[PDB]
Amino acid sequence: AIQMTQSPSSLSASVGDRVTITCRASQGISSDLAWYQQKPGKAPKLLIYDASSLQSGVPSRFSGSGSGTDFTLTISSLQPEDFATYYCQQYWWYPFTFGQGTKVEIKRTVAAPSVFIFPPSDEQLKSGTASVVCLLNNFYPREAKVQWKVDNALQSGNSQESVTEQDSKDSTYSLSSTLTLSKADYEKHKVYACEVTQGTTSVTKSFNRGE
């Protein structure tokens, strides 16, 4: 099958910026390429067909170019409704294949997270498992290092991270890190700490099992 590769996987831009998204095919596909826009929870919307032909109802700031194996999608003046994920698709030969997608996100100033730690509830402990949740609230950019320490012992393999999309108010992200332990392991230890590192700042929020 023909492999489609997009670049970059994600990019941050501002309203009014000129944005260019590249799509490359592993084989020549002439001009049989389409571009799509997709927003969270919605179906994709066709933007361009035949590499350069604009689909009806698509603003003229969207334009496509290229042929063979090198294609580009250009947004001349980025608008607030353009922040979304964009896919290319070849229909040169079966099976039809998509690119992995390029996420166009909102650029903003760096923001440090507000860190909160939540012990497991007494209700959950009666089930036999303990979930310890660390919350990183309203930070930018997306990157952050979160480490769990249980009585100064660094934890690994027993935590999962989840990130929200950019907030509609301040364009920041939020992140949860959930430490999952058995009830027995949780009762055998005292100090539970969540260390969040971003840039030149490390913040450790902790609690002592009992207080």
Place this chain on the structure above:
Amino acid sequence: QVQLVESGGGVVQPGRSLRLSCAASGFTFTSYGMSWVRQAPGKGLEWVAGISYDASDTEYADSVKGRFTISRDNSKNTLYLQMNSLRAEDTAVYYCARSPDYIIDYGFDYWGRGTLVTVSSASTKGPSVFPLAPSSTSGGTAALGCLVKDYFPEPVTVSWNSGALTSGVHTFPAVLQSSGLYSLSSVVTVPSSSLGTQTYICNVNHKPSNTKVDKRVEPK
């Protein structure tokens, strides 16, 4: 008014079969090629199968050849996808999509709403909702929330105070645990001075199990 409406999604155990339908309206259905496109949770788009206007030609993705069959009833304006020998990797939202052609060239100009297919041996289960309680250990702002743990399948919806509280609400996407069940947290930041007077209740709806849970999150 072009409308494409999928149906037939849900939970199916591995190895079983499931049949999706797509009801079309608003255009001459017999003149356009149709396709199925799927999207795994948090992944990209994958073209699944396509069929010509007169049903005389069908094409399939490599991962589904020999397992899936696409067909159409041009007298009922309905598209079908028969999915046999289903695997966990087939878990995705499935869209039916029209091409502006009698075959399936020139992209996909109209899409349905999508229907979720979850392939797993896990049984349907409503969520257990545990409190993420505040202390105030954070100044004028306090954080609280609800741990929505061990439900199947997707999705759950979370509101706060029956929808009256929307500012500062963050509901994280679910993660699939090793048990096969899903889990997520929903959090909200509130004025810490309100913790003694205002009540905060998360409302968790799980339509697949017909379960709604209301959890009062009180300071501890």
